[PDB]
Design a protein around this ligand. Structure first.
Ligand SMILES: *[C@@H]1O[C@H](CO)[C@@H](O[C@@H]2O[C@H](CO)[C@@H](O[C@H]3O[C@H](CO)[C@@H](O)[C@H](O[C@H]4O[C@H](CO)[C@@H](O)[C@H](O)[C@@H]4O)[C@@H]3O)[C@H](O)[C@H]2NC(C)=O)[C@H](O)[C@H]1NC(C)=O
Ligand SMILES: *[C@@H]1O[C@H](CO)[C@@H](O[C@@H]2O[C@H](CO)[C@@H](O[C@H]3O[C@H](CO)[C@@H](O)[C@H](O[C@H]4O[C@H](CO)[C@@H](O)[C@H](O)[C@@H]4O)[C@@H]3O)[C@H](O)[C@H]2NC(C)=O)[C@H](O)[C@H]1NC(C)=O
Ligand SMILES: *[C@@H]1O[C@H](CO)[C@@H](O)[C@H](O)[C@H]1NC(C)=O
Ligand SMILES: *[C@@H]1O[C@H](CO)[C@@H](O)[C@H](O)[C@H]1NC(C)=O
Ligand SMILES: [Ca+2]
Ligand SMILES: [Ca+2]
Ligand SMILES: [Ca+2]
Ligand SMILES: [Ca+2]
Ligand SMILES: [Ca+2]
Ligand SMILES: [Ca+2]
Ligand SMILES: [Ca+2]
Ligand SMILES: [Ca+2]
Ligand SMILES: [Ca+2]
Lengths: 385, 385, 385, 385
């Protein structure tokens, strides 16, 4: 089976809870990796949580966070959805301090970037075998999604950035077939900033919603077909999606400069001119999480919206979030099902531990009754070490 | 292969021990979840233990049992029958503080209820994919079996309650096909109370024996066909099945008010006008367990019975119990095999630990020689934390 | 595939080492069961180590050996050959304080005896489903092999004993087909004593070599065809096989009374009128282990032998031992391959720990070069708890 | 599918990182074996890490490294590539203090040598079943590759040494078919010394690059066809491959006596008259690692080379290294892909711990962009025990 990727997004009314791993609570006693970016991706058969670890466990001296983010120890691993990430249940994928993965219907593509800041190399694997490499073209921290790539009709697609995180950088779309790059194009995007894209397939094309770390408190997007013919923009809604951000107000279809520097990995789903935005509840802190349906929010700049569904209370820590889909080949549906995961970050810099880790929760979009609540991490910090 | 569910219960004389997990004894040293309701359910290929955890391990601070029962941390997980429930051998099923699961011959149906007391939502999954949701209709702790649902001819069936635990509530039978609710009916059951139903298939229909928490010390039952044409009653035997309960005496085919408030999840199997009742040995405490064959106990009110088989001594803790079956498709028999599990609850409120957990034992009904004994939990409490 | 069991034992010259699990050394730090009787049995596909645990781990208070041997906590579990027996790698088989298991080519038969001393019940499972039970007929500790049953032509065979361990008891051969007892016969064996038989298939029949705990320092044997037509005797060699035993001398084809009380589970392989005897090196202590080829030792009473191969030095602890075979269906050979395992018992009563456990080693018979050595347990006792 | 082994080495420009297990960092907290020689080998389906353990865990008293290398506790085990080697994820292979393994397309061949120094026996297994033994022919530490054997056209091939480690010894090539030795030949190699060969298939033949422990600071090699018609030599490059070694200078096509005694397991790949040499960065210590492309280094004695790629910085420990390949049957390529692993040795003698263990990294040769870096072990020593 190659996933066709030709279906359109399912009609939905809200979000039903799909998983919660309690990784940090369990890690208080069990042997659980210190992790970041616990992104989900699915095949035609099953779903997995991918993550990066510093190859260190919770409640151990090696969890000391002072280790640079981009270390030679960092690896991309995966485990079944909803399980604490342990060396006893986790598959090794790639050596990586920035990553993506996705399944095309026939096998897993994983992308893992390691190496020095001035010459990082992305190693691409398909079915665990090295199939290609991509080296840094601007010599300044080649980096990728930290969530699932998108697959349509036997090709898979991702976005990579190279250059400053605080100014203009360079952004490329890659088309990958059985783990080999067969096409790429650089975005002609002056004044845009793309990091940490959340990309999903929809109607034979791909939509990516990303993080502007330079000068945007709304989210940039890029969409493209199988030929890499692309469009770019920012989400117009005055319901601002980044963190930090200003209070909701008048949006812009370009980068909103107020509170624009810095950011958080996030996602959104476009439905016609409307948008489901996932975002933190706080405008200043990585706290809380909510889903907002803004029926004109893709193209219109008002701060009006119609539905809010709570996911994590503002009194609890959240973190990165990303899209994942479930294809008809997996679900038996006639439409592409949208889902998302949230990383619940504990420890530094907000809390007094030597380490920083996340646990995860995830939700799937359904057209049936749902409810808002708070499903926070739940660990009591500090631990012993 | 869909399970037909058209066979009648096997002729049996007694109960042969099937499993014992020693979960709590193992968890004194190993990495074992704090759990409750370790219910067994089987496919055409294998049997699993399902359970709810607060996503915390024995001998750890997060096991602190002051946490609400209905917490956002609670998850339904499963592991192979007879193994200690660990993060290293347990599959994630659903986020849930009340649950059921069963296999239809083709895939697993899991039902996990989470969300707030005033608006809980049951998430249904078939083969791990969300297929439906059911929202609270009385805004008062939507809740379900805590043991296996029953499947017949490609549909599976369960009971949900919404409303007070100490007065009249609302009870519904759900018919589910490949994870989708295709029919439901509310029981017209004034003066009845149904919680925590133990439901099994028998001759193309389903029988549920439940817990009246309001005002009955005998057990309510409901039976129904594939169309949800139902019958209701209480078990007539003066061999009372609930805990607490009075001493054995004259029964009633309606709710026996003496010691009727409160209760424990349990089960019974109807054979003609007779009944096998599983029950605690104590009338006041969750202590001991025994199987009683009362050959007229379904419909007659005397306190006479013909066989008692000891399962757990009165000097040892017991707990929840439930039915599960093994279908002909699994066993190769021409009849439906009755089995049951018993949860052996340790810790709070009876014992001085910060936590409450159960281990489990299980038995299958056989027409060959058996013996009574005591197979208790066996852990030495307290631990270290 | 049903295993035919029609081949004869392979020609061999010695024993090549097959596995060593280091269970107790690993258990010093890891989560490893306290176990006894780590017997191996194989299918047409793979080999497993079966064992009994008290459902307690090494370095834990629950390992306290003062627990009766015949406890309600004891379970039969299995793990892959050569792996430390852990709750994280071990399959649950049966609740049992005495056990057997074997594969017929189509599925696993397990036999697990639990219950009280005066009315123990053997639960038989095939493919993990209960298929039969056998209750104590003398009301005095029904008990079985503690090693693999033997399968020939789709039937499997075992020996059970009921009665005194220090005087005349009752001994039965059972023929089991797909987990159902289809035939049994009681041995007419006055003055014989059979416990803990080690039984293997050979040329369409079964040979069992056992332990006389009453008054024999040589080993009793029983052989039988598929109809349960049997013969009985004792191994004639003056190379005495039990522990304790006298120094080698003149044997007897009946029970050798000198040092005859007490014993140890062991095995031997008959080749024509010759015998491969496995035995401890000490005559008084469960110390050392060696294989001895006595070319006339089955039928003749001299103490002469031709080959000794060391297995464990006399300065190291050994323990129970048993036969297992590998059938042509597994190996591709034209003959039945003999193998054996040895349990290396550590702790009480010989050593100052609260617990008693064994690790294991195993060897297969080959017609190619081999060498004698010592492969002892290797743990340094006591542990922390 | 038998692996043909008829393809020639893939054209490559550099080495892409394939795995990193972080074994020692993880073992600071988790249950991880003390290991040595973590060699990788692959089938037509997957790659595994094989390793020797003393059957003891990190942070435990049994890790005490005063134990002989050649102990009866040492076992060959395997786990998936990139996972910490634990008792919970590792398969048992053989009892062994020296080993090799490889897959022929149909099953795994494992070779494990145990027994005393004066009479060691190699036990060969195919699909886990004993298929042959080879006994010491010089009664002086029979020993083998400590990395994968090489398979071509249904036969697999290895090298064994018997005799002094500090003088002339005896060297044999073995040809093995389905686990059975079908041919062997002794090398007529006066004044050569072969230990710890790294052997790979290439164009229907096999090339082994080895360690001269007697009197060579360059590496000896032997190549042979399927008939065991062989050639011998030393790598001519003045870029010396052993450790210890002199500074680069004039090489020799025979053994380079300067700093020739002692050595380290290593590998090299021949391309035409050129060579990729993997080596430590230090000439005196097992520190650093680098890959050097010397385009005439197989046959010419100059110290010129054209490419250096850094793998581990000189300020970090390295250790043993070996070749492994990925066959077309696995990769879908039309050429034989070269890979290598490096063992990163921590503990004794260089560091103050009771133990010595290695973690691992591995790389595959690619014709696409790569980068040099340092991917060292990363553990902070000592631990607690
Ligand atoms: C998590 O990682 C952190 C970074 O690695 C650790 O913090 C560091 O701790 C070290 C202690 O090893 C400390 O080192 C220096 O501290 C002083 C500088 O302000 C200085 O006085 C010290 O110099 C003395 O000691 C060293 C021996 O290491 C000798 O070489 C010197 O001659 C002298 O005697 C020393 O250089 C760092 O300051 C500190 N890093 C920073 C910048 O925060 C944490 O310890 C670790 N956390 C845990 C819990 O392990
Ligand atoms: C492994 O299991 C063994 C058996 O269970 C334990 O040994 C037992 O330890 C207990 C202590 O609980 C001991 O109990 C009695 O000891 C005295 C009899 O000689 C007697 O003075 C004691 O009576 C006092 O204490 C009890 C409280 O438990 C009160 O009820 C009394 O009123 C009085 O104050 C007590 O009854 C046993 O003697 C002993 N068993 C034997 C026969 O060896 C081990 O402790 C255990 N090992 C470990 C390390 O845990
Ligand atoms: C358990 O939790 C409750 C409420 O949070 C608290 O009062 C109590 O101190 C806790 N117990 C322990 C031992 O931490
Ligand atoms: C390690 O073993 C040696 C020899 O048995 C001994 O001399 C030493 O004390 C041991 N080290 C430790 C820390 O136990
Ligand atoms: Ca921003
Ligand atoms: Ca709007
Ligand atoms: Ca532990
Ligand atoms: Ca009640
Ligand atoms: Ca009655
Ligand atoms: Ca005896
Ligand atoms: Ca003799
Ligand atoms: Ca050398
Ligand atoms: Ca050169």
């Amino acid at each position: 089976v190659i996933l066709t990727g030709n279906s359109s997004l399912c009609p939905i009314s809200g979000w039903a809870i799909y998983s919660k791993d309690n990784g940090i609570r369990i890690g208080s006693k069990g042997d659980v990796f210190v992790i970041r970016e616990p992104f989900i991706s699915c095949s035609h058969l099953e779903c997995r949580t991918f993550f990066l670890t510093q190859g260190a466990l919770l409640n151990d001296k090696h969890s000391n966070g002072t280790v640079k983010d981009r270390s030679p120890y960092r690896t991309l691993m995966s485990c079944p959805v909803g399980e604490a990430p342990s060396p006893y249940n986790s598959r090794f994928e790639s050596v990586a301090w920035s990553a993506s993965a996705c399944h095309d219907g026939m096998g897993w593509l994983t992308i893992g970037i390691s190496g020095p800041d001035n010459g990082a190399v992305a190693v691409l694997k398909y079915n665990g075998i090295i199939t290609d490499t991509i080296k840094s073209w601007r010599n300044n921290i080649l980096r990728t999604q930290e969530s699932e790539c998108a697959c349509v009709n036997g090709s898979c697609f991702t976005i990579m950035t190279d250059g400053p995180s605080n100014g203009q950088a360079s952004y490329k779309i890659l088309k990958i077939e059985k783990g080999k790059v067969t096409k790429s194009i650089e975005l002609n995007a002056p004044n845009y900033h793309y990091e940490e894209c959340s990309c999903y397939p929809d109607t034979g094309k791909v939509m990516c919603v990303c993080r502007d770390n330079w000068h945007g408190s709304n989210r940039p997007w890029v969409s493209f077909d199988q030929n890499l013919d692309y469009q770019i923009g920012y989400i117009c809604s005055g319901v601002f999606g980044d963190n930090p951000r200003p209070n909701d107000g008048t949006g812009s279809c370009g980068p909103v400069s107020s509170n624009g520097a810095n950011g958080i990995k996030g996602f959104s789903f476009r439905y016609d001119n409307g948008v489901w935005i996932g975002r933190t509840k706080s405008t200043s802190s990585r706290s809380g999480f909510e889903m907002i349906w803004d029926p004109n929010g893709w193209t219109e700049t008002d701060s009006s919206f119609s539905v809010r569904q709570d996911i994590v209370a503002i009194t609890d820590w959240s973190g990165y979030s990303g899209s994942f889909v479930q294809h008809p080949e997996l679900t038996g549906l006639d439409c592409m099902r949208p889902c998302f995961w949230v990383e619940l970050i504990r420890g530094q810099p907000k809390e007094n531990t030597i380490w920083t880790s996340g646990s995860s929760i995830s939700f799937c979009g359904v057209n049936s009754d749902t409810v808002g609540w708070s499903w926070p991490d739940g660990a009591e910090l500090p631990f012993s070490i």
